[PDB]
Structures are given as C-alpha cells and as structure tokens.
Amino acid sequence: TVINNWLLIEGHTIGIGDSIADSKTYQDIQNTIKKAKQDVIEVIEKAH
Amino acid sequence: VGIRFCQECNNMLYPKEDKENRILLYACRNCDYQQEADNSCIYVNKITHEVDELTQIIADVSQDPTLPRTEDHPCQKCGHKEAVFFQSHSARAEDAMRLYYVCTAPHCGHRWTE
Ligand SMILES: [Zn+2]
Ligand SMILES: [Zn+2]
C-alpha cells in the first residue's frame, strides 16, 4: 500500500528513448559485428 | 574387378577351382561354358573408401546457376578464369570440407581438386 501510494508521485514508464542507445555505441556494436563476421569468414577459408 | 557373363545364355560367370591343372576358371552353372580367369582377384573390399570423388561428379554441373563460382582458381588445360566450386558428398571419410572444382566454360569439362 505505502509504496504504491508513493509511486503515485514519481511514476514509472517505458518508451523508445529507453531502447535507443548512443551513436558511438552503435558504431562500436557495428564494428564488433563486422570483426566477428570477418573472423568467421577467415575460419571458413581455413576449412576450405 | 567386376562382373562378366557367359556368352550363350548371358548369365553370371562365378569362379571355380580346376583340381587337375590347379587353375581358376569361370563356369556358369546353367551350362557347361568354362573360361579361364585372367584377373587373379575374385573379391576386393575398399574398407577405408579413400576413392577421390572426381569420377562421381559430372561436367554438366557447371550449368547450375545456384552453385558458387570464383575467378581465383584457374583450370589447368585451358586456363579459363571461371570455375564453379562445391563440397564433397562422401558420408564416411577422415575429412568433410574440401572443395571440388569444375571448370565453367561450355567445352572444357575439366574437374580438379585443391
Ligand atoms: Zn551360361
Ligand atoms: Zn578449363
């Protein structure tokens, strides 16, 4: 009871801005994915 | 070694031992045709199956538009740049990833393995 009635003041929500990250973080993620794909290509070439 | 047929009823030859001359011969039990064997082998068994698949793959596979093809590896006899490559199909070998190459041009049916 008491914490629901306090949460009436602060409130809570979820939205798109909670799921959007930084532009530098996006670049880091893309670099990591490209490096991983290049490594899998290298492994495939080693087996080939 | 492989199958051969009697020349009068076209039935199987199978091997017999001549006891007097002590030589092997082939006799078709539906008749009396006896023919001396020229191969001294009656049965062979390639247990490890180390036969390269070049004879199983056909040159017509070059016309498949869904197969991959690279310019890196040239053919030996003609040197056409284009060559489609694909994997093994033997189920039972010490290896499972080697690429079989077939030359892509219409008349050069050259197949080789790197
Ligand atoms: Zn016969
Ligand atoms: Zn060729």
Curated annotation (Swiss-Prot), chain A:
Superkingdom of this entry's organism? Eukaryota
| PTM note | The tandem heptapeptide repeats in the C-terminal domain (CTD) can be highly phosphorylated. The phosphorylation activates Pol II. Phosphorylation occurs mainly at residues 'Ser-2' and 'Ser-5' of the heptapeptide repeat and is mediated, at least, by CDK7 and CDK9. POLR2A associated with DNA is specifically phosphorylated at 'Ser-5' of the CTD by CDK7, promoting transcription initiation by triggering dissociation from DNA. Phosphorylated at 'Ser-2', Ser-5' and 'Ser-7' of the CTD by CDK9 (P-TEFb complex), promoting transcription elongation.
The intrachain disulfides are none
Per UniProt, subcellular location reads as:
Nucleus; Cytoplasm; Chromosome
Q: Could you say which protein family the record assigns here?
A: Belongs to the RNA polymerase beta' chain family.
Subunit note? Component of the RNA polymerase II (Pol II) core complex consisting of 12 subunits: a ten-subunit catalytic core composed of POLR2A/RPB1, POLR2B/RPB2, POLR2C/RPB3, POLR2I/RPB9, POLR2J/RPB11, POLR2E/RPABC1, POLR2F/RPABC2, POLR2H/RPABC3, POLR2K/RPABC4 and POLR2L/RPABC5 and a mobile stalk composed of two subunits POLR2D/RPB4 and POLR2G/RPB7, protruding from the core and functioning primarily in transcription initiation. Part of Pol II(G) complex, in which Pol II core associates with an additional subunit POLR2M; unlike conventional Pol II, Pol II(G) functions as a transcriptional repressor. (Microbial infection) Interacts with herpes simplex virus 1 protein ICP22; this interaction causes loss of CTD 'Ser-2' phosphorylation from Pol II engaged in transcription.
What disease has this protein been linked to? Neurodevelopmental disorder with hypotonia and variable intellectual and behavioral abnormalities: An autosomal dominant neurodevelopmental disorder characterized by profound infantile-onset hypotonia, developmental delay with poor speech, delayed walking, and impaired intellectual development. Additional variable features include feeding difficulties, dysmorphic features, and visual defects.
Q: What does this protein do?
A: Catalytic core component of RNA polymerase II (Pol II), a DNA-dependent RNA polymerase which synthesizes mRNA precursors and many functional non-coding RNAs using the four ribonucleoside triphosphates as substrates. Pol II-mediated transcription cycle proceeds through transcription initiation, transcription elongation and transcription termination stages.
Q: What is known of its domains?
A: The C-terminal domain (CTD) serves as a platform for assembly of factors that regulate transcription initiation, elongation, termination and mRNA processing.
* Name of the protein this chain belongs to: DNA-directed RNA polymerase II subunit RPB1
Origin species, per record, is Homo sapiens
Tell me what gene encodes this.
Answer: POLR2A
Curated annotation (Swiss-Prot), chain B:
Q: Which organism is it from?
A: Homo sapiens
Task: List, in alphabetical order, the GO biological process terms annotated in this UniProt record.
Answer: maintenance of transcriptional fidelity during transcription elongation by RNA polymerase II; transcription by RNA polymerase II; transcription initiation at RNA polymerase II promoter; transcription-coupled nucleotide-excision repair
List residues binding Zn(2+) 2.
C75, C78, C103, C108
- Where is the protein localized? Nucleus, Nucleolus
Please provide, in alphabetical order, the Gene Ontology terms of the cellular component aspect for this entry: nucleolus; nucleoplasm; nucleus; RNA polymerase II, core complex
Family per UniProt? Belongs to the archaeal RpoM/eukaryotic RPA12/RPB9/RPC11 RNA polymerase family.
Q: What SMART domains does the database record attribute to this sequence?
A: RPOL9, ZnF_C2C2
Give the GO molecular function terms: DNA-directed RNA polymerase activity; nucleic acid binding; zinc ion binding
From the Swiss-Prot or TrEMBL record, give the protein name. Answer: DNA-directed RNA polymerase II subunit RPB9
Give the boundaries of each C4-type zinc finger.
6-31
Q: Which Pfam families match?
A: Zn_ribbon_RPB9 (PF02150), Zn_ribbon_TFIIS (PF01096)
The lineage's top-level taxon is: Eukaryota
In terms of SUPFAM superfamilies, this protein maps to: Zinc beta-ribbon
On whether NADP is a keyword of this UniProt record, the answer is no
Q: Where does Zn(2+) 1 bind?
A: C6, C9, C28, C31
